[PDB]
Design an enzyme around this catalytic site. Sequence first.
Site, PDB file in Angstrom:
ATOM      1  N   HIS A  67      39.796  44.551  45.801  1.00  0.00           N
ATOM      2  CA  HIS A  67      40.399  44.729  44.490  1.00  0.00           C
ATOM      3  C   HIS A  67      39.933  43.492  43.735  1.00  0.00           C
ATOM      4  O   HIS A  67      40.277  42.365  44.096  1.00  0.00           O
ATOM      5  CB  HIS A  67      41.919  44.778  44.604  1.00  0.00           C
ATOM      6  CG  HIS A  67      42.429  46.091  45.106  1.00  0.00           C
ATOM      7  ND1 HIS A  67      43.474  46.196  45.997  1.00  0.00           N
ATOM      8  CD2 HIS A  67      42.030  47.359  44.842  1.00  0.00           C
ATOM      9  CE1 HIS A  67      43.695  47.472  46.262  1.00  0.00           C
ATOM     10  NE2 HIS A  67      42.834  48.198  45.574  1.00  0.00           N
ATOM     11  N   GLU A  70      42.134  40.396  43.036  1.00  0.00           N
ATOM     12  CA  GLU A  70      42.793  39.760  44.178  1.00  0.00           C
ATOM     13  C   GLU A  70      41.736  38.805  44.745  1.00  0.00           C
ATOM     14  O   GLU A  70      41.013  39.103  45.704  1.00  0.00           O
ATOM     15  CB  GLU A  70      43.245  40.835  45.174  1.00  0.00           C
ATOM     16  CG  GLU A  70      44.224  41.823  44.499  1.00  0.00           C
ATOM     17  CD  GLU A  70      44.682  42.966  45.390  1.00  0.00           C
ATOM     18  OE1 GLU A  70      45.233  43.950  44.849  1.00  0.00           O
ATOM     19  OE2 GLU A  70      44.501  42.888  46.621  1.00  0.00           O
ATOM     20  N   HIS A 197      44.438  41.018  50.832  1.00  0.00           N
ATOM     21  CA  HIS A 197      44.928  41.421  49.514  1.00  0.00           C
ATOM     22  C   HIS A 197      45.774  40.359  48.824  1.00  0.00           C
ATOM     23  O   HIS A 197      46.065  39.297  49.385  1.00  0.00           O
ATOM     24  CB  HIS A 197      45.783  42.693  49.618  1.00  0.00           C
ATOM     25  CG  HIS A 197      44.995  43.947  49.838  1.00  0.00           C
ATOM     26  ND1 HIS A 197      45.515  45.200  49.582  1.00  0.00           N
ATOM     27  CD2 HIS A 197      43.739  44.148  50.298  1.00  0.00           C
ATOM     28  CE1 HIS A 197      44.610  46.116  49.875  1.00  0.00           C
ATOM     29  NE2 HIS A 197      43.524  45.505  50.313  1.00  0.00           N
ATOM     30  N   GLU A 280      48.498  40.645  52.894  1.00  0.00           N
ATOM     31  CA  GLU A 280      48.823  40.328  51.502  1.00  0.00           C
ATOM     32  C   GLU A 280      49.134  38.841  51.585  1.00  0.00           C
ATOM     33  O   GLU A 280      50.084  38.443  52.261  1.00  0.00           O
ATOM     34  CB  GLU A 280      50.058  41.113  51.046  1.00  0.00           C
ATOM     35  CG  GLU A 280      49.829  42.619  50.926  1.00  0.00           C
ATOM     36  CD  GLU A 280      49.195  43.014  49.604  1.00  0.00           C
ATOM     37  OE1 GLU A 280      48.783  44.183  49.470  1.00  0.00           O
ATOM     38  OE2 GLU A 280      49.109  42.160  48.698  1.00  0.00           O
TER      39      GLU A 280
END
Length: 390
Positions: A67, A70, A197, A280
């Site tokens: 992404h 990110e 992420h 994450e």
Amino acid sequence: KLAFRHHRYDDLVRTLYKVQNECPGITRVYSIGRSVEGRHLYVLEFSDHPGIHEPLEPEVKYVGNMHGNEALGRELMLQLSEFLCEEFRNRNQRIVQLIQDTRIHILPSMNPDGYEVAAAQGPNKPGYLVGRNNANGVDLNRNFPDLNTYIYYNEKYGGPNHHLPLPDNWKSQVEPETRAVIRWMHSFNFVLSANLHGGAVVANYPYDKSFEASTPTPDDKLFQKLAKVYSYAHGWMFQGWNCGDYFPDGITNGASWYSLSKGMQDFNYLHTNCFEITLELSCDKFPPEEELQREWLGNKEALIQFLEQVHQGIKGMVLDQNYNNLANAVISVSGINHDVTSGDHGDYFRLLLPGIYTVSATAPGYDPETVTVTVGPAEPTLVNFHLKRS
Ligand SMILES: *[C@H]1O[C@H](CO)[C@@H](O)[C@H](O)[C@H]1NC(C)=O
Ligand SMILES: *[C@H]1O[C@H](CO)[C@@H](O)[C@H](O)[C@H]1NC(C)=O
Ligand SMILES: *[C@H]1O[C@H](CO)[C@@H](O)[C@H](O)[C@H]1NC(C)=O
């Protein structure tokens, strides 16, 4: 030493080649394909014998920045690359041995096109959405073939529990970045992996798609352990309270958090031998440069420990009636409805928590061979199989 600042495409490329130039004998820079706009998806490989698979030596990978906005995963991978080379040169045996016994592939940015869009916004302030998707406006983590539908059915009514096939025209249904990554997965027998992420701080594991709600895999206990290893080695993930979210132990089953289909994580597990979890790492997807060093220092121990986790369970060779290597053999463990296969060289790997298991191997045209094995908490145990023709 690399500065703790954001690196755009050109600097990212220079950095990778700089590291390679510093540790020539243990690295290899290669591209797995081009982005929509022509940018290379560069990978930096670490191994004392780069460019070749060695039997019984597992392959592992880190993937970041799928992404565009990110960016932490991106920078952590560039810092990690420099760190591994530096520590190898310092003769830190923990790192030297890691590199000698493992083949590590680092893909700092799976979505370089999106990153440039995110970086230009602000600059360096893309917010929640800018640059998330690729150049064609596609979310790469919703672009992988959905194999969950098949596995949920097979787990319920019986059937193949590994290597589910892709749709005939998948090459035309996926983005170039996705296609590059899938071909890459087809090129190496990856055993363990982590996708990085931003947006939260938690270790996310299979399954990502809700069965309808917690949706565990047959390897749930193992995945929880893998996730916990990173979470507890991490500076503050294990706390469980980050970004206003609360995750006990700093981990979570994907589906339990929120259902997600066509993601890369589950694809790894259902289409290949690779066990992947999604990390994450920060509430702020694109943190300010003044926070990069603290993030790096709070992540490096976990980044090293996660990779070291590939060295557990069982591994071995599957041989045919003439004692020659047998590729694509299927190895199954009683009680775990998810098998793995041997790679091109005939070697296979099976991550498993400590315990006693009944393990069996077979292949098309051969009769099964079963053995009972004890898995310890330390290194893996070598378990080979010699199959006879049916
Ligand atoms: C290995 O030992 C276990 C009992 O500990 C047994 O159930 C299993 O069948 C044995 N394997 C073979 C091939 O006999
Ligand atoms: C493996 O070792 C354990 C003890 O650590 C033993 O109980 C188990 O039976 C062994 N497995 C086989 C097949 O002997
Ligand atoms: C491999 O190591 C395990 C302990 O981790 C042991 O129980 C097993 O017997 C070993 N394999 C062989 C063939 O001895």
